[PDB]
Tab-separated table of C-alpha atoms in Angstrom:
chain	number	residue	atom	x	y	z
M	1	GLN	CA	90.227	86.480	141.805
M	2	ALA	CA	92.594	84.466	139.604
M	3	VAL	CA	96.265	85.269	140.253
M	4	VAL	CA	98.344	85.523	137.053
M	5	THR	CA	102.076	84.843	137.527
M	6	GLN	CA	105.098	85.431	135.311
M	7	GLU	CA	108.865	84.908	135.557
M	8	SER	CA	110.200	87.996	137.330
M	9	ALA	CA	113.395	88.266	135.250
M	10	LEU	CA	115.019	86.702	132.164
M	11	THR	CA	118.215	87.481	130.251
M	12	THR	CA	118.984	86.932	126.560
M	13	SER	CA	121.335	88.309	123.894
M	14	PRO	CA	120.846	89.792	120.382
M	15	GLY	CA	119.672	87.247	117.817
M	16	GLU	CA	118.646	84.646	120.396
M	17	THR	CA	115.208	83.175	121.050
M	18	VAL	CA	113.506	83.771	124.413
M	19	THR	CA	110.092	82.678	125.713
M	20	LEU	CA	108.189	84.360	128.560
M	21	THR	CA	105.283	82.541	130.236
M	22	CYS	CA	102.079	83.400	132.047
M	23	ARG	CA	100.312	81.081	134.479
M	24	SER	CA	96.734	81.266	135.764
M	25	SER	CA	96.059	80.129	139.348
M	26	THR	CA	92.655	78.751	138.271
M	27	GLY	CA	94.175	76.108	135.984
M	28	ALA	CA	95.317	75.808	132.375
M	29	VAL	CA	95.358	78.964	130.269
M	30	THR	CA	93.064	78.451	127.263
M	31	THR	CA	92.140	80.476	124.191
M	32	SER	CA	89.091	81.550	126.251
M	33	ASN	CA	91.486	83.650	128.333
M	34	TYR	CA	92.325	85.656	125.183
M	35	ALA	CA	95.849	86.256	126.461
M	36	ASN	CA	97.180	89.788	125.970
M	37	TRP	CA	100.829	90.894	126.080
M	38	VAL	CA	101.918	94.475	126.798
M	39	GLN	CA	105.435	95.925	126.708
M	40	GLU	CA	106.363	98.635	129.207
M	41	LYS	CA	109.328	100.788	128.268
M	42	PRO	CA	110.729	103.588	130.510
M	43	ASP	CA	108.664	106.742	131.079
M	44	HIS	CA	105.509	104.580	130.943
M	45	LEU	CA	105.663	103.932	127.185
M	46	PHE	CA	103.261	101.010	126.712
M	47	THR	CA	102.815	98.962	123.534
M	48	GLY	CA	100.200	96.263	122.986
M	49	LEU	CA	102.023	93.340	121.343
M	50	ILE	CA	99.587	90.411	121.303
M	51	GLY	CA	95.861	89.960	121.815
M	52	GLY	CA	93.618	86.877	121.508
M	53	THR	CA	96.555	84.603	122.476
M	54	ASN	CA	98.426	84.838	119.154
M	55	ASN	CA	97.253	87.930	117.202
M	56	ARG	CA	100.085	90.418	116.702
M	57	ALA	CA	99.222	94.131	116.658
M	58	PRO	CA	100.098	96.084	113.455
M	59	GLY	CA	103.487	97.785	113.732
M	60	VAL	CA	104.783	95.155	116.173
M	61	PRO	CA	107.837	93.385	114.629
M	62	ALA	CA	107.349	89.879	113.254
M	63	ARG	CA	109.885	88.532	115.780
M	64	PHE	CA	107.156	88.640	118.481
M	65	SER	CA	104.644	85.774	118.675
M	66	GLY	CA	102.103	84.684	121.273
M	67	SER	CA	100.975	81.112	121.933
M	68	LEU	CA	99.875	78.596	124.560
M	69	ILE	CA	102.696	76.300	125.728
M	70	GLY	CA	101.591	73.591	128.143
M	71	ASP	CA	99.064	75.058	130.588
M	72	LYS	CA	100.470	78.599	130.143
M	73	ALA	CA	100.321	81.563	127.792
M	74	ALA	CA	103.646	82.436	126.192
M	75	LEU	CA	105.349	85.331	124.433
M	76	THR	CA	108.335	84.434	122.282
M	77	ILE	CA	110.940	86.708	120.735
M	78	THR	CA	112.582	84.881	117.844
M	79	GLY	CA	115.716	86.983	117.290
M	80	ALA	CA	115.814	89.360	120.259
M	81	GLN	CA	117.159	92.902	119.772
M	82	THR	CA	118.673	95.444	122.182
M	83	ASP	CA	115.457	97.495	121.930
M	84	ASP	CA	113.496	94.554	123.421
M	85	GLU	CA	115.017	95.165	126.873
M	86	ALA	CA	111.815	96.091	128.661
M	87	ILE	CA	109.117	94.828	131.012
M	88	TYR	CA	106.515	92.462	129.562
M	89	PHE	CA	103.096	91.986	131.171
M	90	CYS	CA	100.509	89.359	130.334
M	91	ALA	CA	96.803	89.831	130.986
M	92	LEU	CA	94.181	87.078	131.001
M	93	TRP	CA	90.437	87.496	130.473
M	94	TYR	CA	87.979	85.677	132.758
M	95	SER	CA	84.663	86.365	130.993
M	96	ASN	CA	83.909	89.629	132.778
M	97	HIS	CA	87.273	90.821	134.121
M	98	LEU	CA	90.926	91.099	133.124
M	99	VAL	CA	93.844	90.130	135.368
M	100	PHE	CA	97.418	91.311	134.841
M	101	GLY	CA	100.448	89.269	135.811
M	102	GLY	CA	103.336	90.833	137.760
M	103	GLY	CA	105.496	91.368	134.667
M	104	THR	CA	108.849	90.012	133.452
M	105	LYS	CA	111.968	92.170	133.218
M	106	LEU	CA	113.719	91.071	130.028
M	107	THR	CA	117.399	91.985	129.851
M	108	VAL	CA	118.884	91.904	126.342
M	109	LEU	CA	122.687	92.072	126.547
M	110	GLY	CA	123.137	94.189	123.400
M	111	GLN	CA	125.003	97.170	124.891
M	112	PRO	CA	128.667	96.930	125.998
M	113	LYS	CA	129.305	96.640	129.740
M	114	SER	CA	129.520	100.063	131.389
M	115	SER	CA	130.930	100.640	134.867
M	116	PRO	CA	129.036	103.148	137.100
M	117	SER	CA	130.072	106.784	137.404
M	118	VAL	CA	129.876	107.461	141.146
M	119	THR	CA	129.665	110.855	142.857
M	120	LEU	CA	129.363	111.415	146.604
M	121	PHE	CA	127.980	114.702	147.942
M	122	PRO	CA	128.343	115.999	151.538
M	123	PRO	CA	125.423	117.671	153.383
M	124	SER	CA	124.695	121.286	152.437
M	125	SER	CA	125.253	123.880	155.164
M	126	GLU	CA	121.625	124.912	154.582
M	127	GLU	CA	120.451	121.408	155.524
M	128	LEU	CA	122.799	121.297	158.529
M	129	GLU	CA	120.999	124.415	159.815
M	130	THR	CA	117.967	122.130	160.236
M	131	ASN	CA	120.132	119.781	162.368
M	132	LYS	CA	119.966	117.152	159.600
M	133	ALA	CA	122.655	115.688	157.349
M	134	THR	CA	122.043	113.795	154.105
M	135	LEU	CA	124.844	112.355	151.999
M	136	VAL	CA	123.814	111.638	148.415
M	137	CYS	CA	125.590	109.055	146.274
M	138	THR	CA	124.685	109.331	142.586
M	139	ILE	CA	125.327	106.378	140.281
M	140	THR	CA	125.010	106.708	136.493
M	141	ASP	CA	125.820	105.203	133.108
M	142	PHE	CA	126.011	101.553	134.159
M	143	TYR	CA	124.991	98.517	132.125
M	144	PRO	CA	123.712	95.984	132.947
M	145	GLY	CA	121.317	97.597	135.432
M	146	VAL	CA	122.268	95.775	138.646
M	147	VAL	CA	124.352	97.280	141.466
M	148	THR	CA	125.032	96.728	145.147
M	149	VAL	CA	125.625	99.855	147.251
M	150	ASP	CA	127.431	99.710	150.616
M	151	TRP	CA	128.222	102.647	152.920
M	152	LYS	CA	131.046	103.094	155.410
M	153	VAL	CA	131.551	105.661	158.149
M	154	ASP	CA	135.078	105.892	159.579
M	155	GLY	CA	135.938	102.565	157.907
M	156	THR	CA	132.928	100.736	159.429
M	157	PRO	CA	129.976	99.347	157.389
M	158	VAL	CA	126.766	101.297	157.974
M	159	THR	CA	123.724	99.095	158.649
M	160	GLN	CA	121.222	101.881	159.351
M	161	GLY	CA	119.871	105.129	157.858
M	162	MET	CA	120.530	104.081	154.230
M	163	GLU	CA	118.168	104.175	151.258
M	164	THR	CA	118.984	103.085	147.685
M	165	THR	CA	116.679	103.405	144.663
M	166	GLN	CA	116.082	100.538	142.262
M	167	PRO	CA	118.072	100.995	138.998
M	168	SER	CA	116.029	102.927	136.427
M	169	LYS	CA	116.748	103.419	132.721
M	170	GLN	CA	118.447	106.601	131.602
M	171	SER	CA	117.432	108.245	128.328
M	172	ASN	CA	120.583	106.737	126.756
M	173	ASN	CA	119.533	103.193	127.823
M	174	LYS	CA	122.209	102.796	130.487
M	175	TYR	CA	121.043	102.711	134.113
M	176	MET	CA	121.122	105.119	137.065
M	177	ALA	CA	120.535	104.856	140.810
M	178	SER	CA	120.937	107.035	143.898
M	179	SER	CA	121.683	106.178	147.520
M	180	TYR	CA	121.143	108.309	150.632
M	181	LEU	CA	122.876	108.182	153.999
M	182	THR	CA	120.704	110.044	156.505
M	183	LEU	CA	122.315	111.341	159.715
M	184	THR	CA	121.702	113.942	162.405
M	185	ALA	CA	123.882	117.044	162.069
M	186	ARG	CA	125.692	115.954	165.252
M	187	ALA	CA	126.376	112.452	163.920
M	188	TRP	CA	127.859	114.192	160.857
M	189	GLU	CA	130.225	116.165	163.117
M	190	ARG	CA	131.224	113.136	165.265
M	191	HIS	CA	132.546	111.210	162.234
M	192	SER	CA	135.377	112.048	159.815
M	193	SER	CA	135.259	109.773	156.766
M	194	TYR	CA	132.322	108.681	154.620
M	195	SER	CA	132.359	106.175	151.794
M	196	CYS	CA	129.946	105.022	149.084
M	197	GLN	CA	130.878	101.672	147.505
M	198	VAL	CA	129.161	100.563	144.300
M	199	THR	CA	129.640	96.957	143.191
M	200	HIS	CA	128.724	96.268	139.547
M	201	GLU	CA	129.454	93.000	137.715
M	202	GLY	CA	131.884	91.946	140.453
M	203	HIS	CA	133.840	95.240	140.316
M	204	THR	CA	133.795	97.855	143.081
M	205	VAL	CA	133.962	101.623	142.616
M	206	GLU	CA	134.438	103.616	145.820
M	207	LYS	CA	133.973	107.335	146.408
M	208	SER	CA	134.637	108.873	149.802
M	209	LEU	CA	134.974	112.243	151.473
M	210	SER	CA	136.884	113.571	154.475
M	211	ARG	CA	135.563	116.374	156.663
M	212	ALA	CA	139.131	117.730	156.591
M	213	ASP	CA	138.283	118.973	153.077
C	1	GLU	CA	97.361	110.530	114.949
C	2	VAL	CA	95.630	109.110	118.010
C	3	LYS	CA	95.944	111.125	121.221
C	4	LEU	CA	94.881	109.966	124.701
C	5	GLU	CA	95.297	112.305	127.679
C	6	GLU	CA	94.345	111.512	131.282
C	7	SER	CA	93.647	114.151	133.919
C	8	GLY	CA	92.087	114.697	137.337
C	9	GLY	CA	94.659	112.928	139.534
C	10	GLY	CA	95.972	114.368	142.808
C	11	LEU	CA	95.880	113.916	146.576
C	12	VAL	CA	92.589	112.654	148.000
C	13	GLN	CA	91.601	111.554	151.492
C	14	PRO	CA	90.757	107.935	152.483
C	15	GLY	CA	87.000	107.466	152.001
C	16	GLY	CA	86.926	110.341	149.495
C	17	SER	CA	85.865	110.702	145.856
C	18	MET	CA	87.764	111.704	142.717
C	19	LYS	CA	86.803	111.876	139.031
C	20	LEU	CA	89.374	111.067	136.352
C	21	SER	CA	89.024	112.102	132.703
C	22	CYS	CA	90.386	110.558	129.506
C	23	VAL	CA	90.127	112.674	126.352
C	24	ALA	CA	90.672	110.801	123.077
C	25	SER	CA	91.086	112.017	119.485
C	26	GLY	CA	92.209	110.590	116.120
C	27	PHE	CA	89.376	108.712	114.383
C	28	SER	CA	86.031	107.106	115.304
C	29	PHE	CA	86.793	104.635	118.114
C	30	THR	CA	83.461	102.764	118.156
C	31	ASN	CA	85.213	99.386	117.692
C	32	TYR	CA	87.328	100.054	120.791
C	33	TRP	CA	86.971	99.536	124.535
C	34	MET	CA	88.368	102.253	126.808
C	35	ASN	CA	90.182	100.594	129.717
C	36	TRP	CA	91.465	102.083	132.964
C	37	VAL	CA	94.652	100.443	134.229
C	38	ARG	CA	96.574	101.595	137.298
C	39	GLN	CA	100.250	101.168	138.083
C	40	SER	CA	101.683	100.832	141.579
C	41	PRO	CA	105.213	99.721	142.642
C	42	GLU	CA	103.661	96.726	144.443
C	43	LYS	CA	101.136	95.262	141.982
C	44	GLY	CA	102.653	96.448	138.689
C	45	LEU	CA	99.761	96.897	136.252
C	46	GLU	CA	96.273	96.354	137.661
C	47	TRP	CA	93.040	96.307	135.651
C	48	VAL	CA	90.287	98.624	136.936
C	49	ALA	CA	87.442	98.830	134.387
C	50	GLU	CA	86.436	99.192	130.742
C	51	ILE	CA	83.597	100.509	128.575
C	52	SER	CA	82.611	99.836	124.966
C	53	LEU	CA	82.736	103.025	122.881
C	54	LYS	CA	79.945	101.864	120.572
C	55	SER	CA	77.609	104.746	119.688
C	56	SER	CA	74.583	102.417	119.785
C	57	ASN	CA	75.044	101.669	123.508
C	58	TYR	CA	77.729	100.823	126.089
C	59	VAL	CA	78.874	97.779	128.065
C	60	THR	CA	80.994	98.025	131.214
C	61	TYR	CA	83.173	95.560	133.117
C	62	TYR	CA	84.791	96.120	136.516
C	63	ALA	CA	87.513	94.636	138.684
C	64	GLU	CA	86.066	92.856	141.713
C	65	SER	CA	87.883	95.251	144.064
C	66	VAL	CA	86.274	98.386	142.577
C	67	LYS	CA	82.706	97.079	142.166
C	68	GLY	CA	80.274	99.366	143.964
C	69	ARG	CA	83.013	101.985	144.439
C	70	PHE	CA	83.980	103.094	140.923
C	71	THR	CA	81.885	103.799	137.841
C	72	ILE	CA	83.149	104.187	134.270
C	73	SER	CA	81.279	106.397	131.791
C	74	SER	CA	81.763	108.109	128.438
C	75	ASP	CA	80.530	111.280	126.764
C	76	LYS	CA	80.890	110.973	122.977
C	77	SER	CA	80.170	114.706	122.563
C	78	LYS	CA	83.261	115.520	124.674
C	79	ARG	CA	85.346	112.674	123.217
C	80	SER	CA	85.851	111.683	126.860
C	81	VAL	CA	85.810	108.651	129.135
C	82	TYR	CA	85.557	109.146	132.905
C	83	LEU	CA	86.390	107.096	135.992
C	84	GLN	CA	84.389	108.187	139.035
C	85	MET	CA	86.238	106.817	142.076
C	86	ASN	CA	84.602	106.703	145.519
C	87	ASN	CA	85.296	105.347	148.991
C	88	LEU	CA	88.989	105.497	148.090
C	89	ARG	CA	91.567	103.368	149.913
C	90	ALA	CA	95.377	103.305	150.219
C	91	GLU	CA	95.513	100.429	147.717
C	92	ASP	CA	93.902	102.693	145.088
C	93	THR	CA	97.083	104.806	145.006
C	94	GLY	CA	98.864	104.762	141.652
C	95	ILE	CA	99.254	106.111	138.115
C	96	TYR	CA	95.949	105.696	136.281
C	97	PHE	CA	96.141	105.137	132.516
C	98	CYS	CA	93.359	105.000	129.947
C	99	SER	CA	93.976	102.691	126.991
C	100	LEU	CA	92.044	102.004	123.774
C	101	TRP	CA	91.623	98.231	123.436
C	102	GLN	CA	90.508	96.171	120.446
C	103	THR	CA	91.964	92.644	120.604
C	104	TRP	CA	95.126	94.289	121.994
C	105	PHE	CA	95.922	97.449	123.973
C	106	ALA	CA	96.468	99.659	120.936
C	107	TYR	CA	96.893	103.174	122.393
C	108	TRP	CA	97.902	104.456	125.848
C	109	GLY	CA	97.772	107.769	127.707
C	110	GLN	CA	100.619	109.342	129.694
C	111	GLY	CA	98.865	108.662	133.022
C	112	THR	CA	97.584	110.635	136.033
C	113	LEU	CA	98.762	110.041	139.601
C	114	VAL	CA	96.264	109.359	142.401
C	115	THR	CA	97.563	109.552	145.978
C	116	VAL	CA	95.067	108.311	148.568
C	117	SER	CA	96.385	109.698	151.854
C	118	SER	CA	95.422	111.962	154.741
C	119	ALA	CA	99.013	113.177	155.126
C	120	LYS	CA	99.868	116.881	154.908
C	121	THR	CA	100.780	118.449	151.572
C	122	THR	CA	104.436	119.327	152.184
C	123	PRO	CA	106.446	121.585	149.807
C	124	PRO	CA	110.056	120.492	149.023
C	125	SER	CA	113.218	121.739	150.661
C	126	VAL	CA	115.802	122.258	147.906
C	127	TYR	CA	119.456	121.885	148.882
C	128	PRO	CA	122.569	122.281	146.664
C	129	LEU	CA	124.873	119.328	146.067
C	130	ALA	CA	128.379	120.637	145.371
C	131	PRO	CA	131.738	118.792	145.288
C	132	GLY	CA	133.225	118.600	148.782
C	139	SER	CA	137.679	117.333	133.044
C	140	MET	CA	134.103	117.767	134.231
C	141	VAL	CA	132.279	118.248	137.534
C	142	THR	CA	129.000	116.740	138.715
C	143	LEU	CA	126.685	119.137	140.557
C	144	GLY	CA	123.323	118.258	142.085
C	145	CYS	CA	120.019	119.262	143.611
C	146	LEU	CA	118.551	117.507	146.662
C	147	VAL	CA	114.750	117.834	146.743
C	148	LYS	CA	113.927	116.762	150.266
C	149	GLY	CA	110.724	116.109	152.172
C	150	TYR	CA	107.783	116.783	149.845
C	151	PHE	CA	104.305	115.237	149.619
C	152	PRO	CA	102.647	114.132	147.457
C	153	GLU	CA	104.425	113.275	144.207
C	154	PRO	CA	105.444	114.553	141.728
C	155	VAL	CA	108.159	117.181	141.477
C	156	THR	CA	109.909	118.371	138.321
C	157	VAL	CA	113.547	119.481	138.133
C	158	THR	CA	115.221	121.519	135.372
C	159	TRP	CA	118.686	123.105	135.112
C	160	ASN	CA	119.249	126.746	134.119
C	161	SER	CA	115.546	126.729	133.150
C	162	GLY	CA	116.022	123.806	130.737
C	163	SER	CA	118.906	125.503	128.892
C	164	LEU	CA	121.250	123.026	130.584
C	165	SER	CA	119.843	119.694	129.292
C	166	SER	CA	122.871	117.434	128.663
C	167	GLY	CA	124.355	115.461	131.565
C	168	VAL	CA	121.073	115.758	133.485
C	169	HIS	CA	119.837	112.771	135.475
C	170	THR	CA	116.832	112.897	137.806
C	171	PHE	CA	116.571	109.848	140.057
C	172	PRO	CA	113.464	108.074	141.482
C	173	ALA	CA	112.091	109.355	144.774
C	174	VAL	CA	112.437	107.432	148.024
C	175	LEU	CA	109.586	107.531	150.551
C	176	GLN	CA	110.019	107.845	154.330
C	177	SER	CA	107.391	108.889	156.900
C	178	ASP	CA	104.986	110.259	154.271
C	179	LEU	CA	107.748	112.370	152.729
C	180	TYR	CA	109.437	111.864	149.375
C	181	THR	CA	113.023	112.770	148.507
C	182	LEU	CA	114.820	112.723	145.180
C	183	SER	CA	117.983	114.140	143.650
C	184	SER	CA	118.993	115.505	140.264
C	185	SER	CA	122.574	115.740	138.993
C	186	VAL	CA	124.193	117.546	136.068
C	187	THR	CA	127.690	117.277	134.587
C	188	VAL	CA	129.412	120.339	133.125
C	189	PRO	CA	133.062	121.202	132.234
C	190	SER	CA	135.345	122.191	135.130
C	191	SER	CA	136.260	125.366	133.225
C	192	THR	CA	132.612	126.538	133.174
C	193	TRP	CA	131.833	126.063	136.880
C	194	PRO	CA	131.810	127.975	139.117
C	195	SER	CA	132.593	130.799	136.661
C	196	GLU	CA	129.197	130.363	134.993
C	197	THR	CA	126.243	129.928	137.346
C	198	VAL	CA	124.346	126.622	137.550
C	199	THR	CA	120.863	126.626	139.108
C	200	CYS	CA	118.215	123.918	139.537
C	201	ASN	CA	114.537	124.800	139.147
C	202	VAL	CA	112.122	122.659	141.170
C	203	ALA	CA	108.334	122.690	140.782
C	204	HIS	CA	105.968	120.875	143.174
C	205	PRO	CA	102.474	121.284	141.613
C	206	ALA	CA	100.607	119.901	144.632
C	207	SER	CA	101.670	122.856	146.799
C	208	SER	CA	101.995	125.328	143.896
C	209	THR	CA	105.703	125.622	144.700
C	210	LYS	CA	108.525	126.794	142.448
C	211	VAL	CA	112.111	127.090	143.710
C	212	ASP	CA	115.377	128.067	142.040
C	213	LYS	CA	118.584	127.011	143.801
C	214	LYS	CA	121.950	128.278	142.579
C	215	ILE	CA	124.823	125.837	143.120
C	216	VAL	CA	127.873	127.571	144.621
C	217	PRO	CA	131.276	126.096	145.691
C	218	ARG	CA	131.690	125.015	149.356
């Protein structure tokens, strides 16, 4: 029944020190909670880093250390590397059950900035036969992995029928996302211009299409 | 090398039962505890249960929320650990992982997806995404249930430039897209086709992308 809480997001750079923490709702974290730390990398690649508060698993680089700092468990990276950009979970033991925290997304600004590649696709005629129209906006090869996506129809912001995925890591360690504008086939025919606007690190990239093409 | 492989996941109705398996190989794991951990978008990682793999006898621990609903067991002769799930609820939905623990979570499986829903198994509709140096083509995989699908391009022979995005969920139907980038000189003069599989409905589709 204890709730274990962690910072949701932290950012560091190569060579810098960063500390993640892990609070128990029941009170101070002690060595009796045998704090565990687990790294989640993309495609569900999990690595146990720390057990018993401060015991580092074999194979885990020396730059990782676990400890108790104040009333909390802590994971510290002393000399962070680009490869440490990942999600870190803590788990505390309560005598006969384990409780995971919500995880911390660590960003490690090791890669150069990369603006998104944006592509906007019109509805397929096959889909339109179902009386439905979906525009798909693909967004790839951006770093860091934060974007805002805005849609316009005929120059007007859309506030309805939109769906954007959370950024997820590509195999090359840049980020991707997709956004969908869902319309009826008739709505599609009553409008002329459609625009997908991706803002990344203050910079906007727009792709649009015209039903005249 | 140590290998852990989960299986048994799929769609199952609210109130229903489902048995997961974890098969482990590598060396004698008697010092280890086999843990089941599930991942959802909402909770992140969530502890379910564990069992000591001692040959002398076992010890089990359970999350409060699964007590009296799930049992964990192991069969040394089959190098297997099992999670019998019962009286399943929507909150039990997620990717279930087995992990070998001793002080730390040393080894992990690839996971098996459990969808607790009474919604209809729906095969995907597959629609081409064509443009209205290089050209980005795509594949819209619309309105399937449950997860997952898999997408390849020219039966895997087109692997570079391929991005498959996370699904979105609307009204018990998932949708995702996959894009590929190829030289403008090679399309449309060489054919590009996406291959979608939806295991849950035993569906396989090939969709050729043509200009339009």
